[PDB]
């Protein structure tokens, strides 16, 4: 008998396979019999006993996705159906246990069953796609939120000039190098078998190519380290005295008590980060890499940034910061008049850096991902040895002793090809991952030159805000930056005007904007509220009056 809309194994005209018969379509013709689409597999068949047509369909190609709050917590599931709408009946026949886990919500990706949709929105937790996310006693699906709603009261003749700043330090993590791996091809695929080696060299230089390719990766890792660090050949030394104008650097300068001379922040970073194959040691050890970091760190605390462009020219730190403040656009007088406050903010901000790394579970995640990747690849490559690869036995010796010479050659060739195919796959992954690490190494080198050796005017490149300083810290297979930024705060509204006309002449401000509380007009810079009496020194007279929109009457004198 014939069965429709079921998972039966069709056997029309001796053609095996499992599918769904469905109905007659596709306009079968006497010439057009046993038709097939681009997918082939004879999607449509004609009945042998009768003249009807059956369209073969794969048995429930749903490709469902299961969401799990992790087995560490309580067990829960919410199956997401891709493409299938709210009906969700690909194969109603199935064990009764998972029938309830087919609470119905229809997303753009498809129908989700197993969780309750919440009209509220929160930061995304488990991404489900189509702008929907999941969060666990019971998992709830919530539309992701782009952020806190904000509105700017845009208005002409109105300006909000900041009256406070805030020194903020942010941590940036960048991998610099991978782990060098070297493999002996002869030993890997032909273990303890000279007869296998007699057949391996028959294959050619396939083994040599893989070994040469890994050599280029290995020598590139040392180059990457030589790029980020080793940018200053001179090795400077922290001054005996450490009175850097009230500023504190004890958390970043090398600790004399520490046997490895690693800084307290560096020590925290180091602890957090945890045949035929070989793991070659890096050329630059940690004791030398940290020495390179100390040289750059000691070359920026004193001598300013000049040391990155030639000879080091000593400059007192209170003066150095002043110049940097001029870069962001704040007159130096601010630094000298608020040296006590800025020093305390810098000291307090750098103190919380260690706690931020310790508290965050994902801290140093970028460095750990590299370690967890190549180590997994090596473990996966080793497990390929136990793979049979369609051979009588994985043991080369076994095949030789249990098979005739003219019959063995087939099996070892089958096994040799399998091992070689697996080996070259790992090399290809390393080459691809090497490019990704190389891009980070070049990016890290650029940040070292532009953020540490000097001050960068690029927006959102060194740190979030107006960049002031940058201090590098060594890390296992990577580097860590401590960007010091300038962030305004405590803004107040003021009434502005494009120009001020006096004695029939327009007066534009040489620098800063024109402000007035309501009684008298003033000139202040764009990043700090510093009222100044309007005179001829700070305002340049250009152009006749009555040509600018928005001028206001005033006496410049």
């Amino acid at each position: 008998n014939l069965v429709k809309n079921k998972c039966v194994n069709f056997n029309f005209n001796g053609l095996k396979g499992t599918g769904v018969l469905t109905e007659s379509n596709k306009k079968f013709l006497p010439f057009q019999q046993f038709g097939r689409d681009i997918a082939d597999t004879t999607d449509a068949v004609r009945d042998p006993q009768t003249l009807e047509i059956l369209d073969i369909t794969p048995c429930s190609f749903g490709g469902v996705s299961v969401i799990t709050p992790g087995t560490n917590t309580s067990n829960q599931v919410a199956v997401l159906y891709q493409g299938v709408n709210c009906t969700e009946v690909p194969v109603a026949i199935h064990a009764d246990q998972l029938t309830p886990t087919w609470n119905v919500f229809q997303t753009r990706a498809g129908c989700l069953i197993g969780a309750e949709y919440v009209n509220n929105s929160y930061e995304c937790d488990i991404p489900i796609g189509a702008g929907i996310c999941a969060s666990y006693q019971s998992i709830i699906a919530y539309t992701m939120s782009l952020g806190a709603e904000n509105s700017v009261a845009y208005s002409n003749n109105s300006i909000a000039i900041p009256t406070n700043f805030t020194i903020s330090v942010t941590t940036e993590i960048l991998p610099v190098s991978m782990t060098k791996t070297s493999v002996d091809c002869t030993m890997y695929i032909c273990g303890d078998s000279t007869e296998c080696s007699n057949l391996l060299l028959q294959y050619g230089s396939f083994c040599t190519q893989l070994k040469r390719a890994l050599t280029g990766i290995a020598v590139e890792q040392d180059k990457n380290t030589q790029e980020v660090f080793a940018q200053v050949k001179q090795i400077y030394k922290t001054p005996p005295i450490k009175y850097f104008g009230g500023f504190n650097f004890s958390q970043i300068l090398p600790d004399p008590s520490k046997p490895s001379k690693r800084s307290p922040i560096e020590d925290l970073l180091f602890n957090k980060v945890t045949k035929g194959l070989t793991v070659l040691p890096p050329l630059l050890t940690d004791e030398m890499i940290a020495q390179y970091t100390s040289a750059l760190l000691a070359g920026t605390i004193t001598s300013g940034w000049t040391f990155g462009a030639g000879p080091a020219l000593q400059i007192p730190f209170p003066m150095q910061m002043a110049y940097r403040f001029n870069g962001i656009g704040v007159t130096q007088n601010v630094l000298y008049e608020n040296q006590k406050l800025i020093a305390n903010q810098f000291n307090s901000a750098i103190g919380k850096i260690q706690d931020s790394l310790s508290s965050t579970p994902s801290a140093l995640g970028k460095l750990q991902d590299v370690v967890n990747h190549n180590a997994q690849a090596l473990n996966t490559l080793v497990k390929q040895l136990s793979s049979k690869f369609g051979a009588i036995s994985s043991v080369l010796n076994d095949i030789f002793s249990r098979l005739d010479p003219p019959e063995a050659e087939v099996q070892i060739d089958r096994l040799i090809t399998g091992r070689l195919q697996s080996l070259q796959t790992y090399v290809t992954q390393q080459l691809i991952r090497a490019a990704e690490i190389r891009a980070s190494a070049n990016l890290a080198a650029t940040k070292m030159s532009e953020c540490v050796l000097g001050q960068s005017k690029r927006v959102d490149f060194c740190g979030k805000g107006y960049h002031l300083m940058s201090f590098p810290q060594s890390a296992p297979h990577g580097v860590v930056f401590l960007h010091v930024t300038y962030v305004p705060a405590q803004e107040k509204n003021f009434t502005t005007a494009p120009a001020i006309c006096h004695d029939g002449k327009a007066h534009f401000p040489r620098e800063g904007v024109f402000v007035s509380n309501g009684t008298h007009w003033f000139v202040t810079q764009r990043n700090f509220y510093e009222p100044q009496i309007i005179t001829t020194d700070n305002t340049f007279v250009s152009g006749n009056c009555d040509v600018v929109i928005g001028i206001v009457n005033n006496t410049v004198y």
Partner: protein, 58 residues
Amino acid sequence: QPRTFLLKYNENGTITDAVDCALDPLSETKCTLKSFTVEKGIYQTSNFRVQPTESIVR
């Protein structure tokens, strides 16, 4: 009854626990992941739920 089972051994050739795949989406995910422990996240199964029916000779 034809089923798929994830047999676990304790280096002694004895089964300590077995994952019964196709029983529910939770167990099927472990069958696809080939691990008794599933980390937090969304995963795609291998469609072990369906089983072939009686063959039809034609």
